[PDB]
Design a protein around this ligand. Structure first.
Ligand SMILES: O=[N+]([O-])c1ccc(NS(=O)(=O)c2ccc(Br)s2)cc1
Length: 358
């Protein structure tokens, strides 16, 4: 019944192979998408190393520049790029065709990522630094890496809005299993907590009855105990707030997907919904407040290896290994009809409408 309406809208935005991108470079090590504004691909044509920048507001005319770097990450908001070659890092102002700042590390940077409009996070074998793109400041060590991540492939680093809660995520192969290892660091308490988790995000959420927002930490994992999603308040609640009750729910995998697991998460600020993407290309939607599973479906035939918030829709945008750039967001006119008549959850239908953010 009502099978024709979904609580989501799926969109295809681009096919990178139609823009002259070699499929061999559509992957984690060579393609970055730090926000929904740009995609950056490192390619080698002949023996000329090149960087291709796709402006998502003008994607038919990508810029191909012969530059040699081990990694390239566009700023989330500005026409600014960070480039790395060996231990040397440089940030460039593209519009002004000028170098902004540079720094030479002592230890190799194995993973890096913009965490804000002006700060890039650097991960070495044993520590995590934050580096502002402004002024003269060098990178600042934020914390030392926990031993539980030793030997992991680092796959993500992200923070809460106030950059007081920092999360490093790695994976490792244990026999034929992919095991997630996370390090949650409190800047104020100077304490680390190891967590078995595969994908995660932070969110700000205003509880009914509270005047101030709660800082939530959501992570998903598939371990020996199966698929689980947790939603937790981190830190001391703002003065006057009631604490957010911890939520824990199952993450479902069908019998033919015993080897699937979570790989990406983004949270809608507007709709208080968690988007979870699995290795096999499934998307799940969960209510942030309760963890209720709203929707699941396989939306990609190829693995989606990078995601970002999709600002205009408060959704999630991602690139899959074939070069499809795709997004999922809440369908604002159909989600409450779906919850009412397919999920048959009038509590959630009511709570959603009361939030009145559709
Ligand atoms: O902003 N750019 O697109 C842009 C900025 C600087 C250059 N110079 S470079 O020698 O190729 C260079 C490569 C790696 C580092 Br690290 S510096 C080229 C392009």
């Amino acid at each position: 019944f009502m099978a024709q309406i979904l609580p989501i809208r799926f969109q295809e935005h681009l096919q990178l192979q139609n823009l002259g991108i070699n499929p061999a470079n559509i992957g984690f090590s060579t393609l970055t998408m730090e926000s929904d504004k740009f995609i950056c691909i490192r390619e080698k044509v002949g023996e000329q190393a090149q960087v291709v920048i796709i402006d998502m507001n003008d994607p038919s005319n990508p810029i191909r520049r012969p530059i040699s770097a081990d990694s390239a990450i566009m700023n989330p908001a500005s026409k600014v790029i960070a480039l790395k070659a060996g231990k040397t890092l440089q940030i460039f102002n593209i519009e002004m065709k000028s170098k902004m700042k540079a720094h030479t590390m002592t230890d190799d940077v194995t993973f890096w990522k913009w965490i804000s409009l002006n700060t890039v996070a650097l991960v070495t074998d044993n520590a995590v630094y934050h580096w502002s793109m402004e002024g003269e400041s060098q990178p600042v060590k934020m914390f030392d890496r926990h031993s539980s991540l030793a030997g992991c492939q680092i796959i993500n680093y992200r923070t809460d809005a106030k950059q007081k809660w920092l999360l490093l995520t790695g994976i490792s192969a244990q026999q034929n299993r992919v095991v997630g290892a996370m390090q949650l660091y409190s800047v104020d308490r100077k304490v680390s907590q190891p967590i078995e988790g595969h994908a995660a995000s932070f969110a700000q959420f205003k509880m009914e009855g509270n005047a101030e927002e709660s800082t939530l930490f959501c992570f998903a994992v598939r371990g020996q105990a199966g698929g689980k999603l947790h939603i937790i308040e981190v830190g001391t609640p703002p003065t006057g707030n009631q604490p957010f009750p911890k939520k824990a729910v199952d993450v479902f995998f069908p019998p033919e997907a015993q080897n699937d697991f979570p790989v990406a998460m983004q949270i809608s600020e507007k709709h208080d919904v968690v988007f979870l993407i699995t290795k096999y290309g499934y998307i799940h939607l969960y209510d942030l407040e309760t963890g209720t599973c709203i929707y699941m479906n396989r939306i990609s035939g190829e693995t989606i290896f990078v995601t970002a918030p999709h600002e205009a829709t408060a959704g999630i945008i991602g690139v899959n290994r074939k070069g499809q750039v795709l997004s999922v967001c809440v369908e604002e006119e159909n989600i409450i009809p779906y919850i009412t008549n397919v999920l048959q959850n009038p509590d959630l239908a009511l709570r959603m409408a009361v939030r009145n953010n559709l």
